[PDB]
Design an enzyme around this catalytic site. Structure first.
Site, short mmCIF file in Angstrom:
data_model
loop_
_atom_site.label_atom_id
_atom_site.label_comp_id
_atom_site.label_asym_id
_atom_site.label_seq_id
_atom_site.Cartn_x
_atom_site.Cartn_y
_atom_site.Cartn_z
N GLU A 1 -36.43 -69.46 -18.97
CA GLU A 1 -35.95 -69.70 -20.33
C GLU A 1 -35.63 -68.31 -20.92
OE1 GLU A 1 -38.82 -71.01 -23.28
OE2 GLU A 1 -37.33 -72.27 -24.26
N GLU B 1 -33.54 -72.64 -33.69
CA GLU B 1 -34.81 -73.14 -33.27
C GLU B 1 -35.81 -72.94 -34.37
OE1 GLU B 1 -36.54 -71.75 -29.40
OE2 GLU B 1 -38.47 -72.51 -30.14
#
EC number: 3.2.1.8
Length: 189
Positions: A85, A176
């Site tokens: 990620e 996010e």
């Protein structure tokens, strides 16, 4: 608008929205590379537009990012084999996610300077379900909202420090949020 986890393509751009279900989180898709997201008392969520499979695109993006609490605006993505990620972090809210992380070096790109970090994530959600994987950061040393991100400069700088990258999965410009409220709108190209 979208309020549940979802992926697709819209006006030629890939979109990903993921939420753990907390709070109200509403992603609204627009022309071209545009998305918007407005959230209240969220859990955790990611959202934006881009490519999948990606290929180290030079990304241009503009718009507005307005978090009330902990949130991130980053060019964001995954690799597989290995599972990684990664975040090229352009702005963030109250919490600097590199707190407590070991500094690996810098890369300067598209006019800015970014500090590089890696950390292991243990039993976290991922594009392969709950897993364990490494998570790479380029954190810009001063926050900005909008500009060009030459992803390949970051990736080259990361590899030169021993950070392994797998096969590209998606890559987006992600807003996010973590236990926060706010809004943003971003147009990706």
């Amino acid at each position: 608008c979208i309020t549940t986890s979802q992926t697709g393509t819209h006006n030629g751009y890939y979109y990903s929205f993921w939420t753990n279900g907390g709070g109200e989180v509403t992603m609204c898709l627009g022309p071209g590379g545009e998305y918007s997201v407005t959230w209240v008392n969220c859990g955790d969520f990611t959202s934006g537009k881009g490519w999948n499979p990606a290929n180290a695109q030079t990304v241009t993006y503009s718009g507005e990012f307005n978090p009330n609490g902990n949130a991130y605006l980053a060019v964001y993505g995954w690799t597989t084999d290995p599972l990684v990620e990664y975040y090229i972090l352009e702005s963030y809210g109250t919490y600097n996610p590199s707190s407590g992380l070991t500094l690996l070096g810098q890369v300067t790109s598209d006019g800015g300077t970014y500090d590089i970090y890696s950390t292991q994530r243990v039993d976290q959600p991922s594009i392969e379900g709950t897993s364990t994987f490494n998570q790479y950061w380029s954190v810009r040393t001063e926050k900005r909202v909008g500009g060009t991100v030459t992803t390949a400069n970051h990736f080259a700088a990361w590899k030169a420090l021993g950070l392994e990258m797998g096969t590209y999965n998606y890559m987006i410009v992600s807003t996010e949020g973590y236990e926060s409220s706010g809004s943003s709108t971003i147009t990706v190209s």
